[PDB]
């Protein structure tokens, strides 16, 4: 039985979840630490090439 709860508005009625019949619509961040290393490496390479410009 429902009691005294807030009225839910969860907004999840489209096909976002990948299943056997749907491609889905999602985004994850498993590449976050690898991309952090890549951006720093590019900045260091660019500094070496354009030396001594700021």
């Amino acid at each position: 039985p429902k009691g005294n709860n807030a009225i839910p508005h969860v907004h999840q009625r489209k096909h976002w979840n990948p299943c056997s019949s749907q491609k889905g619509n999602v985004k994850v961040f498993f590449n976050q630490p690898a991309q952090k290393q890549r951006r720093r490496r590019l900045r260091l390479l660019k500094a070496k090439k354009i030396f001594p410009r700021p």
Partner: protein, 144 residues
């Protein structure tokens, strides 16, 4: 963790707490907030009385940056002073100057007993706050 759930305790009960009668079926009473005025009326009227209906005028293209106006009371002013400057402020001597904008405040309200005289720079001020700070020995300087 899966080892703290009720399902572990229910291995061998055959009904998992839903009853021999009634059973556990999918979506009795409907989906979501269905039936808010039919067969779910008592719940809605008792706990959310103002849900169905309209009220007030409309405002197209609301920009919340225009209405930014935080408030602080007269009795909380010592939280912004330097840790030393308080407790040695007197009536006709040099007094600390407080800028509300730099601390993220817009209007000064006048609740409570002021603890130390000071000079306050603010955008807006209430009439009671202006009276109390003047009586204590301070002043209000309007800023934009």
């Amino acid at each position: 963790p899966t080892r703290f759930k009720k399902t572990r305790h229910q291995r061998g009960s055959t009904f998992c707490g839903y009853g021999r009668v009634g059973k556990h079926r999918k979506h009795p009473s409907g989906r979501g907030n269905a039936g808010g005025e039919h067969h779910h009326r008592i719940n809605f009227r008792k706990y959310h009385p103002g849900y169905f209906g309209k009220c007030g005028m409309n405002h197209y293209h609301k920009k919340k940056n225009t209405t930014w106006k935080p408030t602080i009371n007269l009795d909380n002013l010592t939280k912004l002073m330097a840790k030393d400057e308080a407790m040695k402020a007197k009536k006709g001597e040099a007094l600390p100057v407080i800028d509300l904008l730099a601390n993220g405040y817009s209007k000064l309200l006048g609740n409570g007993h002021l603890q130390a005289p000071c000079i306050v720079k603010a955008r807006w001020v209430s009439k009671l706050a202006d009276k109390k700070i003047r009586k204590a020995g301070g002043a209000v300087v309007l800023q934009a």
